[PDB]
Amino acid sequence: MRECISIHVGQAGVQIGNACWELYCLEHGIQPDGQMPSDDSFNTFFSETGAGKHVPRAVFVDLEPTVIDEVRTGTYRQLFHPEQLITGKEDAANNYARGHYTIGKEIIDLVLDRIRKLADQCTGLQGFLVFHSFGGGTGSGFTSLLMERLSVDYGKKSKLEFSIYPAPQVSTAVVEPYNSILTTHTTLEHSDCAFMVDNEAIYDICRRNLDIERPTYTNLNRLISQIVSSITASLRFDGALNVDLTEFQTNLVPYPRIHFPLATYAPVISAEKAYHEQLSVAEITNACFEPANQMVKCDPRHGKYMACCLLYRGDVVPKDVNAAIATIKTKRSIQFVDWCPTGFKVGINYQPPTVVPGGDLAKVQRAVCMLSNTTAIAEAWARLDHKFDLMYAKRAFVHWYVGEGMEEGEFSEAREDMAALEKDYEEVGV
Amino acid sequence: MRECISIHVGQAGVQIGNACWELYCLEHGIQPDGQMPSDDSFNTFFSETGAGKHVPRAVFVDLEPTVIDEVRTGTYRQLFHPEQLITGKEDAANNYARGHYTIGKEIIDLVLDRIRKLADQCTGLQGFLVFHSFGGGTGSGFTSLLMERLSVDYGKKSKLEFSIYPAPQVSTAVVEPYNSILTTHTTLEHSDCAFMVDNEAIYDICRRNLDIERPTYTNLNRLISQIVSSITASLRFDGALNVDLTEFQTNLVPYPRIHFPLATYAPVISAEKAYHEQLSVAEITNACFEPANQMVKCDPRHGKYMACCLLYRGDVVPKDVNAAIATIKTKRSIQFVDWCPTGFKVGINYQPPTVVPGGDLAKVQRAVCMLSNTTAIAEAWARLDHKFDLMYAKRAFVHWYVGEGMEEGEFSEAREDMAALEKDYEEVGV
Amino acid sequence: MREIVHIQAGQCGNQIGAKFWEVISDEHGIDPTGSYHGDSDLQLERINVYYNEAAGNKYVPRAILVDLEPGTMDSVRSGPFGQIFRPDNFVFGQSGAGNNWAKGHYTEGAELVDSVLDVVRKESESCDCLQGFQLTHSLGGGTGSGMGTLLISKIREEYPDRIMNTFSVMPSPKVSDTVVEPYNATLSVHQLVENTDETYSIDNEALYDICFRTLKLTTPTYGDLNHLVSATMSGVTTCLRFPGQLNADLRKLAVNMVPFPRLHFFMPGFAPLTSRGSQQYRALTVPELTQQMFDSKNMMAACDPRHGRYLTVAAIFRGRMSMKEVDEQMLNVQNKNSSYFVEWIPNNVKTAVCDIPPRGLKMSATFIGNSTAIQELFKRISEQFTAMFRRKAFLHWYTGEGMDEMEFTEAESNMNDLVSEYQQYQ
Amino acid sequence: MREIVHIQAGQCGNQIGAKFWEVISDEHGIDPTGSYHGDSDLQLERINVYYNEAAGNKYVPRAILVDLEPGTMDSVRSGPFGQIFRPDNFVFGQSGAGNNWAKGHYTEGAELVDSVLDVVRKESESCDCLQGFQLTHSLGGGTGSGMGTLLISKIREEYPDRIMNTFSVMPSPKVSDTVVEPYNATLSVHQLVENTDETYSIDNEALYDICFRTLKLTTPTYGDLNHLVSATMSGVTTCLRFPGQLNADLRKLAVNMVPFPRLHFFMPGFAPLTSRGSQQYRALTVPELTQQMFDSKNMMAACDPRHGRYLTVAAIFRGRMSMKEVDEQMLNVQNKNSSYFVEWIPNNVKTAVCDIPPRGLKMSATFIGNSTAIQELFKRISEQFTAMFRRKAFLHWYTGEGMDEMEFTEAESNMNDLVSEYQQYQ
């Protein structure tokens, strides 16, 4: 009942996983060895063996051994089933075609089988939670090989997808635009709700709200994990207005292809700041409509809102929430589309946000995660297809992709399909 | 009441015996000196003398001294009666005709005298358990000499036979195809249920399920003994649905010559994984229908099932078993014959599988041994009679067999009789 | 798990190699005896990248040593780490290359290469999963230039899909010890442009400039030059030997570094580099580590990158550091220096970050630049070559080995084709 | 319990024999005095296979020592282990064989064989169950070639069903010490093809090739050659002296190794063999033992197996090892080398595995090849014989012993019949 299989692909997905599973163990009170000292609240994420050991409903996949061998050696080595951690022989080299066509074939039929040996333990599997990098070779190419299989083997089941997406200026690779554009078929055809996130936006959120001058990835992953906990909290706990994983989508997604919401969390705040402000429902609701808190570097004021899911958790009351979203409807800078007169889906859940004890983020009685479908996100696509255009006009790295079994025409067919999505998000704003 | 005489022949049968008697001693709580510290559960396998010493109902036979002199010197030197460990001077040289006509001709009337002195201590002897190699000279030739005698001396009594059979690729001898084909008269005419087992299939089970990268024969024999403990468990213990040794045959054997079932065991599992798998009755039932767990390298999907005996042991309930076999009947890849609408014989026994303390195979609440009559096994015969045909077309080693008193025409008469068995298993699938 | 096979050719290749084996053995915590003596499980968890296990827990380097004289084998084997190598992996001739490429490629190394290749086969098939070949040599003289490129050709034909990664010390005008260096180098670069997946171009003039104007060494030896080379050799494989925030295999470098197939001639560098009398006064922090790393003085080929544009740079950082600070600095560099990067690539910098800095450093960066300025190294060699070849000088020593004058015309033709392809994007 | 009777003939047979008795006395832990001094019960359990028990728990080896000269008896009796043998079992003449087969077979040894054979009876009647005869000799010269094959004929007629198993050092052109070597061997091979159940063909050219190209010995003696032979003699009987996962008697070898009655001219080998200065760098394990064992440089006859196909190979392993790993490697060899095995046999490799490896190594493998490449050993002797015999050279030394010219014609006829039967299955 209410299970979610969680798939963590390549270094970014595995390292966000290593923060998600750090959080879910604390929030359910599971030890890092998988035991539980002293109710079904853990069941969405944890299978229970007869011995009294909890086991996570997850798969970690990397085509190179290094990051998953860290998990198999660090403090979580006792938690996972030693076959649900899957390592290939050779790296995908930031090349989509190694992930999808050449190295992915040597491990996909093992990955998909271990996913099936998790599904046979569920009773009403609610959906999939797929975590990856858009810029990676495994991140783009292996996720796109895996989603194509999952979308024929589990066609009804909703596939939610958490993507670290290329930034305006911050980048780690030269070929990040190629891998991202080649991924756009995956998200359009074989995904049901795709949460784009940006490293440069979280780096700025960390600088302004957390007072941390120079963050690592472990800081970012303790913000991305906090969103997925807050999405799943209605699946795991009691609330005044619990939201199902399918109910969420019926309010977020206005049209079949328009399933790329922004996400944001409030209050992101340092423990030193959190004493000197009161953090009421109205304050944390207004914080979600600041450009300063969006986790993709695009401005929501250059768009129109189609729908917002305000998923509150902790000590919040429907009085306060209605009184808050009445002020958001009053502000003329926050503009909805003419065809969504309701605008807001509200969720309210009684479980406060857990604090990771080694984290930068305050204890707070309340949080909200706002997940928001808006026309503005098309600018994050207009940035990256302008990076693609400069390189494909030269064929600047194309021999590495053609050399590993890809058709050269797939680059044109992917830039074409992205232009049809960037068209669709401009078309519905009117 | 409910005795079995276990006859262990050649090196393979004696070394499987040294694992069988290692297990039975642990399972009944008998010390390796035959004493029992502190119900008649042991009575099937052990005679009890007035000193409080339990002596096994076993005969060990080899035409050479080396392997039984090791049994006479190791930890079990005090278990066995010294004259039921039987040895000759001269090795059978992987030559059937030395085992049958020339060397075993001398030891046979001493082997029978021990079997007579064991049967005269039984009261309602249930049958014989005969352990051997198909590829050996003692394994093929001496077992076929002995069975011809036991089938006139004890004509009513059920003769169950456990055979290590030649593999698709793994082989230890050049003449393994000759000895195996010459044995096919023994199993057809002088046996009642013959369990073929393959070294290469267990080597692959060890690699995939125990995760031992490089196993010895001690690892194989500890799986082969575990199946016979599970066949005999209903003779030895209390259960919900105990199965008699002839009740077993009345459900396994559809036709007089169609008595070559496959065997498999589940869960084969290591201590690394047994604490993370559920090992529910549904999973360990389904594991028996995987090609991955069959102990002969043939694919059951290239056959049809005639009958299955699912012999469960440990903590199981008839609710769970009926609910499990209902899913097996639902799966279109597991195909029964049109003339067996019932298909399944179920046994359920309350005694869990005993761990050998030195072993790789983990402690578990449940096991099933599935013993299964299927048309697929004819491919393991089609492999080996194609090895025979290449050598007999040249008469490639025939002078060693003709030189030791065999008729040359017995090779044609054995390849002929094998083709009539391989015909019978193809004929009944329709 | 991503094994490497490492090969040393001639005096220079065996000297930069036998110094590298002292560096990566100090990283992995291996005694000169071959015994493990390190601190950390992270030192041992990837020792299979460069070593084989042997009985008694002795570790043997997966190195093959090649020469046409015994005297460099005697110099490596009698050296500080000389005991650590497998005695049966020393493969040698008994008369030198004479500083002649054609002796290396056609006569004295053509005899020997079959006894190299069967040792390379023994070590490569004994690997679990080979990633590539790491070959150290020089382009001057005859053993490294002519036998090493024969050996690249033979290994390339047998392992077509594995990374061929070469570290190539090569001629420059103001620091030279051979008359026939331009001939040997021109005949050798003709093999590297076709066969290698990466070649790291290294210069004794630039390695002396680091020693004089950065380290302030009064009398830098070849042992001090070999220490600068081997730091960048340890640097680029770090991400398959140790964990990190961003992992980059040698192939993950190649896909990002090499836009068009033949433009794989890189220029390495290292940070920090200080005098031992100024390490007390400097911060090793990522901004200071970056301002050094992009300095025209820090790079190990004499080509000033300000005489061209980078196609790609890779900065492989090591140590506990912020990804914001690393991503900030690799942005600030290519925006404030935008006239020195090609403007048809939207980001020219690859980054990688390992969690384990070199022993005795809190941070390190290894730099790889694919600058068009490297046209100057191939140009000046081609201009030295042209002057000797226009009058056929010294060619009886090469044509005596049965080489054609047509092969000199064709090698310098292919050299100018390499110069033209770098100049095209400038 | 499967006793063996061992017989030594001429200088070579007594020298490979007197070294063999030092090797198996080290295995069984027997002192040069004949007293037992070993570690283990397994050493004593089968000591009857090669020794007789005598008073005071002294062990006396079941050798018969045969020569036509006293000087090799004097050299054995005075040697490292000479005092071990029974004084009555030294059976000898005074005037030698003159390197003449016909002196061995018709004159000097025909006188002596009545005094040999009646000692072979005293040892065979002291046996509980004799399995066979293990005869060491050479096919060059006159004592081993001509008296040893007289003695094979006499023991074969008296014991027709016991294993006759011979270790036969035999001529080759590049390592030769006798003018009439081709004659003596051709007259002797004519007896071996009819009477023996197994003959292990050994060559001084191949035993010197192991000493130079594997062991790297600078000056290999006959004592070093005798050590390589006697390692494979200890090897093939191991499975009746020690326990194992797969036991193979000399008869269990013969049934698997000899497809057609006369094709029993085997070719032995041994592993691991390592250069003395290199052992610490080598991993002792089943796939390295395999890659040595199945390579053309390791076999103890001059025949390169790449000039034929194997009929059967037996690999008798010793040590604690996996049956999956043994069965995997003996599969991988004959599938990856399938052009070198006959394709009318569906598996060409016999395996055996003993639990007790030789003293001082963790594992070992004795290799026995049967291959159509053994045609080359019989061919080159037959063509050296032919080139002398067309001009009747040296025949007055043989016809002086009353031998016919017809016996030379009939021996070389039977030699070409043995060459033709191996070449038939090529």
Ligand SMILES: CC(=O)O[C@H]1C(=O)[C@@]2(C)[C@H]([C@H](OC(=O)c3ccccc3)[C@]3(O)C[C@H](OC(=O)[C@H](O)[C@@H](NC(=O)c4ccccc4)c4ccccc4)C(C)=C1C3(C)C)[C@]1(OC(C)=O)CO[C@@H]1C[C@@H]2O
């Ligand atoms: C107290 C202190 O700070 O000591 C430093 C030091 O003073 C300086 C000057 C060191 C020092 O470097 C040199 O003296 C040197 C001389 C000629 C050529 C190259 C280097 C040092 O010797 C070098 C040494 O580096 C290492 O030990 C690294 O692990 C290095 N390996 C070796 O140098 C090595 C030496 C002997 C045997 C085996 C290895 C390494 C480099 C890259 C990748 C892996 C390992 C270090 C930190 C120092 C001293 C000791 C003074 C410097 O080198 C490095 C690589 O850090 C030179 O400029 C840097 C900055 C350092 O501050």
Ligand SMILES: CC(=O)O[C@H]1C(=O)[C@@]2(C)[C@H]([C@H](OC(=O)c3ccccc3)[C@]3(O)C[C@H](OC(=O)[C@H](O)[C@@H](NC(=O)c4ccccc4)c4ccccc4)C(C)=C1C3(C)C)[C@]1(OC(C)=O)CO[C@@H]1C[C@@H]2O
């Ligand atoms: C520390 C160490 O590794 O010692 C080894 C050794 O260095 C090497 C080089 C040994 C050594 O072998 C030789 O030197 C040699 C020289 C000429 C001809 C044959 C051998 C060794 O002497 C030989 C000796 O082997 C034995 O003792 C065997 O049990 C052997 N018996 C004898 O050699 C022997 C010697 C004196 C008296 C009686 C017996 C044997 C072989 C087959 C069957 C039964 C017994 C061993 C392990 C070693 C040394 C001591 C260096 C090697 O031999 C063996 C049989 O292992 C040669 O290649 C192997 C690999 C070994 O590593």
Ligand SMILES: Nc1nc2c(ncn2[C@@H]2O[C@H](COP(=O)(O)OP(=O)(O)OP(=O)(O)O)[C@@H](O)[C@H]2O)c(=O)[nH]1
């Ligand atoms: N927030 C965050 N971003 C990460 C993390 N790890 C990697 N990234 C991002 O991942 C993007 C590039 O993808 P890769 O890390 O190379 O993805 P990959 O699947 O491992 O790629 P391959 O090595 O080719 O298989 C970069 O833009 C990084 O900023 C992490 O732990 N947290």
Ligand SMILES: Nc1nc2c(ncn2[C@@H]2O[C@H](COP(=O)(O)OP(=O)(O)OP(=O)(O)O)[C@@H](O)[C@H]2O)c(=O)[nH]1
């Ligand atoms: N699983 C297993 N297989 C064994 C064992 N011992 C031998 N075998 C198999 O036995 C088969 C060959 O038969 P032999 O071992 O030679 O049988 P044998 O009766 O002793 O033959 P003879 O020596 O001629 O008397 C091979 O295919 C081996 O894989 C053992 O302990 N376990």
Ligand SMILES: Nc1nc2c(ncn2[C@@H]2O[C@H](COP(=O)(O)OP(=O)(O)O)[C@@H](O)[C@H]2O)c(=O)[nH]1
């Ligand atoms: N860095 C470095 N350069 C060297 C070394 N030895 C020689 N060189 C230089 O680089 C060139 C190498 O050529 P060399 O290796 O002698 O030719 P080879 O032996 O025929 O391959 C020489 O002319 C020297 O200038 C050394 O130990 N280190």
Ligand SMILES: Nc1nc2c(ncn2[C@@H]2O[C@H](COP(=O)(O)OP(=O)(O)O)[C@@H](O)[C@H]2O)c(=O)[nH]1
């Ligand atoms: N391996 C080995 N070969 C020997 C030895 N002594 C001689 N040989 C060689 O093999 C041949 C043996 O012939 P030999 O035994 O002298 O003839 P015989 O005494 O008449 O039987 C000689 O020509 C030598 O080349 C020895 O100790 N060991």
Ligand SMILES: [Mg+2]
């Ligand atoms: Mg990756």
Ligand SMILES: [Mg+2]
């Ligand atoms: Mg046997």
